[PDB]
Symmetry: C3
């Protein structure tokens, strides 16, 4: 009888502590032995959320659809970042150059080309650490909503089309 | 007595295998039935980490604060990526155009406009796949730390302010 | 005997419901008490996946190696986003300016400088909300695969090197 009591009491501790470790509102019922399903929220890419009733479902959703504030809408192959300290974001993005970024579907990286002058000298940012790629040859992206950059010898700001327009008027 | 022995032995296997499945240093104590709490590390956006004692707490932290190397500091609405193979990063970012990126708080996407010439011809990157947006109309971002781009007919590198400065001196 | 029956039946419910909550194909065996290990897939940064046999291992892999479509290949310090609604991506990236982005290894942010004219006026995007940084002083990135931007007074598109080349020929 003492053994039966011990097992019952300890099994309740097992149920309770399992539910506690799961979180997501899981609870243990000593009358039935059931742990009620956890509810884990994940963030879809379309402005909605999903309720997951297992840990595995939540992990799969994190990979399939992203996390809050970081979403790629795709079923294409994973991005690949093999460069040292490199970042690859989006389906089929490949950052194989060191200290670089590939961002956007199909974006690739090739080595940075240092530019100090052109045939005009004294360029700022003449010694790049790597590239920041927004696409690939033949699959370029138009970079939009760029604020006017400083136009000075020291400036490493990007310039926008309105600035090139003004200088050619 | 054999039944009591069987239950005890099997319940220890249940406790052990639950702790193993949880990981995070969770352990089972057959004397009490308790699974000790796991410790799961998540990465905050301020250079610190958090210790989570449930799976649900860790999942919530991943969404609220990001993962190592990918942080958005916000409580505003999720980004939304509805374009095919599109990427949306940051609070209120919306990438609804296909093969595009919206990155930054409030960034939006509109269709790319192909540009082969302007009133000057022979532009490289005249057939964009989509846009890479760093903001929205009236909420543009200054793009900074841009290395000097190649200045040649083939170049799809961005140019910086020092380069526009040099050509107008 | 009824108590032994009750415990056995309830413990099976505990095992089953634990396996259900774990997901990842975990199953309970009433003959042994064992929950078979879950298998949780995470995405490495080199085009491969990993099979994790605990929740903690999966969480650690998500942080160490990223999620599908979002990978930074590094063991350097976390990115830091302390600016309001700011985004920091990549090892050692720091977005401390509000409404800004730092993306790329070692990228930093400093305050946007509004530019409406230069010594040329009527620039579009003269009131930036913040910065979009692809690097840091002395560690700039060459921005690549930029489609030709609109060249007009209204344009906030980035311009590429071929466009600057054409205007100086």
């Amino acid at each position: 009888s003492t053994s039966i009591s011990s097992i019952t009491t300890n099994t309740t501790n097992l149920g309770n502590s399992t539910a506690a470790a799961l979180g997501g509102g899981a609870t243990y019922d000593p009358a039935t032995g059931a742990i009620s399903a956890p509810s884990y929220t994940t963030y879809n890419a379309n402005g909605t959320t999903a309720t997951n009733t297992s840990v595995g479902a939540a992990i799969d959703n994190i990979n399939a659809n992203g996390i809050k504030y970081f979403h790629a809408n795709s079923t294409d192959p994973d991005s690949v970042a093999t460069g040292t300290n490199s970042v690859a974001i989006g389906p089929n993005a490949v950052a194989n150059v060191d200290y670089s970024v590939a961002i956007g579907s199909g974006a690739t990286t090739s080595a940075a080309v240092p530019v100090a002058s052109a045939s005009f000298g004294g360029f700022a940012g003449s010694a790049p650490i790597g590239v920041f790629s927004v696409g690939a040859p033949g699959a370029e992206r138009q970079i939009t909503n760029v604020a006017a950059g400083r136009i000075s010898a020291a400036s490493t700001d990007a310039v926008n089309g309105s600035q090139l327009y003004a200088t050619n008027s």
